[PDB]
Amino acid sequence: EFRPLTLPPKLSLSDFNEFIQDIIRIVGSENVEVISSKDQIVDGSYMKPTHTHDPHHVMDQDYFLASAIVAPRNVADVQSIVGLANKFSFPLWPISIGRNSGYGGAAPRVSGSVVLDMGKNMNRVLEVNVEGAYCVVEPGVTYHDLHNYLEANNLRDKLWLDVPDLGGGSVLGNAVERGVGYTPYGDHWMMHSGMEVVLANGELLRTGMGALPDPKRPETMGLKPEDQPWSKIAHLFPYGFGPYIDGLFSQSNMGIVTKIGIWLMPNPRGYQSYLITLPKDGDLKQAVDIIRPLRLGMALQNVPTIRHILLDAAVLGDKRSYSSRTEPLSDEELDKIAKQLNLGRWNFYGALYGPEPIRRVLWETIKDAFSAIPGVKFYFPEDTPENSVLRVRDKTMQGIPTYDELKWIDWLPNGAHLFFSPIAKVSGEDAMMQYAVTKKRCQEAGLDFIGTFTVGMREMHHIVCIVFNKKDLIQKRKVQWLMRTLIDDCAANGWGEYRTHLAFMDQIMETYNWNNSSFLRFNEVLKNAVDPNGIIAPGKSGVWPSQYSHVTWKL
Amino acid sequence: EFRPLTLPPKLSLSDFNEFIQDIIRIVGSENVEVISSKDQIVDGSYMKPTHTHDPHHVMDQDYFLASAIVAPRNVADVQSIVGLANKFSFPLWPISIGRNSGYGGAAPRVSGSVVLDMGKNMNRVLEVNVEGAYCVVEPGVTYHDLHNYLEANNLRDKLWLDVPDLGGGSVLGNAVERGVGYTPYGDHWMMHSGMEVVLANGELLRTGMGALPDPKRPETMGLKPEDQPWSKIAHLFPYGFGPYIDGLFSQSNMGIVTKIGIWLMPNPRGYQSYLITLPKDGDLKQAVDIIRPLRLGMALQNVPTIRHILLDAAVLGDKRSYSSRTEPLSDEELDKIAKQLNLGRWNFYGALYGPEPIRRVLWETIKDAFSAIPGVKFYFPEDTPENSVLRVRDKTMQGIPTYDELKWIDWLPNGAHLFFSPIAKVSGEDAMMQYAVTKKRCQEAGLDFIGTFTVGMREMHHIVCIVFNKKDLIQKRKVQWLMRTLIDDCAANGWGEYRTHLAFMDQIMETYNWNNSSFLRFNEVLKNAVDPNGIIAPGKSGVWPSQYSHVTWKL
Amino acid sequence: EFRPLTLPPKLSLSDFNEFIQDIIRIVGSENVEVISSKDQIVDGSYMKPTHTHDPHHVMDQDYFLASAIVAPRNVADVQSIVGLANKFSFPLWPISIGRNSGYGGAAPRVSGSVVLDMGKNMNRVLEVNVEGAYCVVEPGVTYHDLHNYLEANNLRDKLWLDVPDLGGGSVLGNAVERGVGYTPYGDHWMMHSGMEVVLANGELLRTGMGALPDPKRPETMGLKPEDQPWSKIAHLFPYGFGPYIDGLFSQSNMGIVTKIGIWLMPNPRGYQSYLITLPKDGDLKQAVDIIRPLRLGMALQNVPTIRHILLDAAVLGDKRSYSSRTEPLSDEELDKIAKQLNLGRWNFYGALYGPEPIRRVLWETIKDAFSAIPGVKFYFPEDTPENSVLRVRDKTMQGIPTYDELKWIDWLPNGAHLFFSPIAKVSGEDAMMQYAVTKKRCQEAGLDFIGTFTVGMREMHHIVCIVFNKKDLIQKRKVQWLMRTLIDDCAANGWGEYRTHLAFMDQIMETYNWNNSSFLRFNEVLKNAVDPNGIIAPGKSGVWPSQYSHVTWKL
């Protein structure tokens, strides 16, 4: 194609054309796609995501957007595209699914960048192994896809998938990002083993035991490396020998991932989701403290989650379906909605897995522990209305994907999500302070507070859900202001953020400044050593190649 | 001091002297120690380890040995020593305890290197936190030290330490090496969070949330960075934000570690070790298969271990105390010794943790499962003689360190350990093949086979114990030959090794050659980028700085 | 000499010795002085200042301190010392007087640095010219010295010196720093013309018209450049032709200044100091607003100053001589002390200069303007007790130096000054907000607020006087905390600082970060271009040469 709406820094249209001309010859025109005009700038839907920019844009819609899109047919193409990118110093921005909304979606940090759609063609579930209780996968496999594959193959009785709320995302895309999930296998990054990735220099590289070569059998002769099988231990033990480099690949521009090993929980032989509604707002504090020991003690098995009242209601209804009021709902109004829905001002969803004797025993401990809270009330999914959030999480908590939760994005008219995500201690006092600070700022911006803690062993990801109408420019600015201020306040109180949207990766990296930004400095060193040309996703997590001046690029 | 018995490559005695002269001015003479003569080359004891070379030398005793030794008083000294090392391009080789015997002990890969004794002065238990259920520590803290600290502080009822067999090693030294331990917290590397290390350039760097700075209070003003407190989440969540670099620090020369966060298991409120003796040699196969599901299913909680007959006997007695025979004992003789000691030809030690109802239920499942094996017999520690290996592991399985196990090193006269450690699937067929291959080679070398599997979730570390008399030069050569051959055979069958001795790190790295040694190549890139001068432990895990020619150095 | 208590970064004692050995050969032993021991670390007095470190240390006393001291005999030596410094890459830190206390005194930012005492030998008043109404001077001339020179020469009737509070400082040292003074000639940096300085490369360079060479007369033949006379216009017009580089020399490490032109106010033919006591604390606001127009309108001629009550009392008495209380005095107590001393809660000192008709007219306007304030009261020096602060400033306001003001440093036991100095608008509202913020933080730290505004045309330097006992380590930390917090708060409100102490130049430079620290980046470029080796005062104002890593050095 001819003229992109915008282009990478320091490059002529003459060069873009020779570059794109060459890519089309490689992947064929069916695969390439140049962004020539506004009618191309459509904000999709979660069901059919837009690969050109951020769907949930806090900033201008056309702010971050690609010059083109390119779907490699397979690994060889990636190696090739990468080679061309080096010739032109054209920036790439890889993606498996494009489903990362609330964190910038498919949009690239630096505009005019070519977006590699790793997912379109490399869609394959490469392997599922019952004895090893794991599988292998390409960037294209969403959670739903895997679930079906297990189900078609009747393997669902043998092994369970762990899954985040909405089911559409890339299994590996979410993994590299360290996204959370609900079962005992909830920490996604923790559950991987052996990976494969294309370096900036286009060379292939497996990791961990992935490096020990599978011995040569007559049947495997002549295979290209990307097609060669993995050795037996590759997916069973992550460490390998020597330095453990896998982390360099999480949340970073060090290289493009092509396949990845992921564990799978054997069917536990027992399950029963549950609920415990906390009556008061202040109950958040005692509940957390009651939880701390249950988590360390292994009473609570999976990643449970304390949900705010509005989150469950957002799933059940629009703000309009509850109040004509155009401002943050009052504590009074919040108490009222809970009475309508039968929920507490906070609501703890969780689960039990195992044979009955284990389950019965755990259930006692849990129920007995939470009783210290006046007014607590325990419901099983059966015990609730056929639309309840519980009936839904009951599936999420057992590997069944769904999409019912997107409904909450609809609280305001033109829904658009934006996640603020500070980490917080498994402490009632710390959790209480974080909530208050986040709430007041929200009120200042005119937004309803909404969030959910997701309980890790020694920590909790506090996930603030900023819903906002994507067409009110004023609200957007208030929102940008909201984010930036929240970042600084929590920072000023020991709180970090585990992930964020393109428009703030720079600010958040800056919070990580102990010892004069020593951490970032070490990374850039690794970065430039690995990708001299800064071809791969420059600016991810705030790491900039030497070519990009921090003055022009930071934000 | 004046003249070291050997010196680093490419360096004058004139330079060694100016270098050492300067170090003495920094750390004071009490801290430095030059190796001038043979009387200095004493092979210590496990209780008082030698810092100058390998105690268990398969190779010549004086092969790998330092030019001097230097104990930094604190972090500032390390930064300083490092700075001098760069001026002279003198190679450093860090160590916390020196306890890594069976993997080369305190000896450096490249001879004449200065050995940093990080442990002598930086001995402090920096923190223990009950709510977070973790602690922080300097290189000097051994497992015993921590246990006492917990016990002095009466905290032992609140939190348990995880511990490897012998208790003397460095808590962090073993952690960076990814050493195994017995409780549920057995995977040491997995249990860390937040670290601190000195880069080749001497700059400080915390990691993970360690990077988010603790807000400034009047009390903490003026503190030097190394003395500054960590932010609240630092030890609670390992990921931080951006690339997860911690692995670059495991089994590698990327930098020197100064402190490290480590988790601690809350007292489980229940415990009972157990034993299950497998009668026949061939029972190894079914036992493994019976185990696979129990492990994934969480029936088996901690890292259990299948011990070979001779290992338990070595603890109970010398080969001489069982046979005047100078060659590998026959299967007949092996069957006989088991009858004497009441053990099976294989013996599964493990444990249960939790309230009685959980414990009772698990015990049923386990006992019921293993019964498929004809002749199995279950003993509790009480049910056995007051010297039994079980009475010992009962302590190991609950965080109590010991030293009773060193007795096995004594099988031959001049005991000397050497660990061959291939990883193997949690499969009876795979486990059986690995054992046979390892045994035959052992027989070829005239050595008794001895080993123990240590069961991970999806894998098992097969630990071959090569005992050999450290004074028979012939036996040593047979042993070198043994190792090298075993490395190649297992390689030729998909088997890797998770760790090894200095004399074979090069060979083992070479097994990891998928795609033309792509893995090693990526590392050297990272290496040279990070330490231009190759000052830090060159050759660790086989990674060589550009200065060392692979022709002269590899081995 | 042999061994300095500390040394510059990256340097051997062997090198220090060869370096110092060579300097001694140049300047002779009388001039050099190595710091070998603690007895050398004496905190002097203002009358006999210590050249080795900070007298008023907020930080550890021995924190910032030189390796040695060297007094060049003349310009040639400076050029030479500089040349040696380049060979060794030894850092220099120039100073004229050492009188910069409350900003770190004679101490160097980077420790172990050699301190050039420019003042000892280069002490000469090079010229005084009545028609041009200016003079020329070396680094050694203090204000008192110049005053005497004028007075010996009977020139005092012809021209007046402008002078800061205490009279001991270097006329040029204070000028390059942009220090303030009391007469109409109060802006010191503004009053200079033509300078001379030694570049990092040791080359000489005059500036402005200083560059146009004085034509050659037989009498001036053979003169060395440093001894050559200036052309006629050199001291009369500052701009010269082409880029105006003089500013590169203010508050920066660009080069060492050797002489400098400075204007002198012709005797005005009339003078009368005055006072106006504002009764209430809140009167600060209206007073400022009444002042704004008087300043722009030229009613107020010199740099007047609004003094806080405690400042005048500190001069009159110790906190102990007013209250046994160990904490910040109450507003009540403050009102009481004013009644005792006859002063307002704020007190405006200023002056009139000119023939009587001008003076009479101005006096009316001023008196009439300030009357809008209820309770104001106007005193002439005559109208007050023979110890009054007014009797003192009456001299300061006419070029007469004094030392009476040091008495205020004595408020606490071990007096030690530390200046916080944010700039503020000539507005009652802005001035009021700044005062409140600064006061509350002071109260938080347990310190009495004390300060004085010094009124510029369109702005006011708010000078917060942090007195603190230099031996209470706790108080010191509270103070460090005080400074750092004040810096951030004022920053968060548009307020900058025109100068500061070594321990905070880095933090303050960071406040100046518009557009991604663009300002600092531009400077480092200029820095490294000019001094490749970073020999000259690295870290001044936060500007670091490329050799110093920002991670290790910043603070």
Ligand SMILES: *Cc1cc2c(cc1C)nc1c(=O)[nH]c(=O)nc-1n2C[C@H](O)[C@H](O)[C@H](O)COP(=O)(O)OP(=O)(O)OC[C@H]1O[C@@H](n2cnc3c(N)ncnc32)[C@H](O)[C@@H]1O
């Ligand atoms: C709207 C929403 C989002 C959401 C959620 C609930 C709602 C209502 N619940 C989630 C949850 O419980 N846990 C979670 O982690 N995320 C959840 N989200 C956010 C989002 O939907 C998911 O995180 C989703 O998995 C993200 O999208 P996807 O998984 O498809 O990722 P992507 O679009 O490919 O972007 C991935 C990013 O990582 C890097 N990347 C991706 N692929 C590669 C390859 N092959 N190589 C290198 N880097 C890669 C890119 O930087 C890209 O930005």
Ligand SMILES: *Cc1cc2c(cc1C)nc1c(=O)[nH]c(=O)nc-1n2C[C@H](O)[C@H](O)[C@H](O)COP(=O)(O)OP(=O)(O)OC[C@H]1O[C@@H](n2cnc3c(N)ncnc32)[C@H](O)[C@@H]1O
């Ligand atoms: C003889 C023996 C050994 C043994 C064992 C049973 C017997 C009878 N059981 C073990 C077990 O159950 N699990 C295990 O991991 N090891 C066991 N061993 C072997 C050995 O005793 C232990 O592994 C022991 O912990 C190792 O010694 P130590 O822990 O003291 O380690 P070290 O002497 O300091 O050497 C550590 C190596 O790692 C690197 N290193 C160490 N400190 C640093 C720092 N600060 N910075 C950077 N790198 C560091 C070095 O490369 C060094 O070689």
Ligand SMILES: *Cc1cc2c(cc1C)nc1c(=O)[nH]c(=O)nc-1n2C[C@H](O)[C@H](O)[C@H](O)COP(=O)(O)OP(=O)(O)OC[C@H]1O[C@@H](n2cnc3c(N)ncnc32)[C@H](O)[C@@H]1O
């Ligand atoms: C305690 C105190 C201080 C004070 C004051 C009242 C009291 C009670 N009143 C002052 C006032 O009204 N105005 C003012 O500007 N300062 C006042 N102070 C602070 C201090 O006493 C004076 O500012 C004093 O003039 C500073 O000391 P001095 O003038 O002697 O300066 P120095 O010791 O030489 O340090 C100068 C700095 O500038 C750079 N420098 C100095 N000479 C050179 C040369 N030749 N070349 C290059 N740079 C040079 C150095 O960086 C040095 O740090």
Ligand SMILES: Cc1ccc(O)c([N+](=O)[O-])c1
């Ligand atoms: C809904 C949601 C969004 C982003 C996250 O990171 C997340 N989590 O549990 O980690 C959950």
Ligand SMILES: Cc1ccc(O)c([N+](=O)[O-])c1
């Ligand atoms: C005894 C021993 C020696 C080395 C190891 O690595 C080990 N392990 O369990 O990992 C156990």
Ligand SMILES: Cc1ccc(O)c([N+](=O)[O-])c1
């Ligand atoms: C007393 C004092 C101290 C530092 C200054 O800067 C100052 N000034 O008027 O500029 C006055």
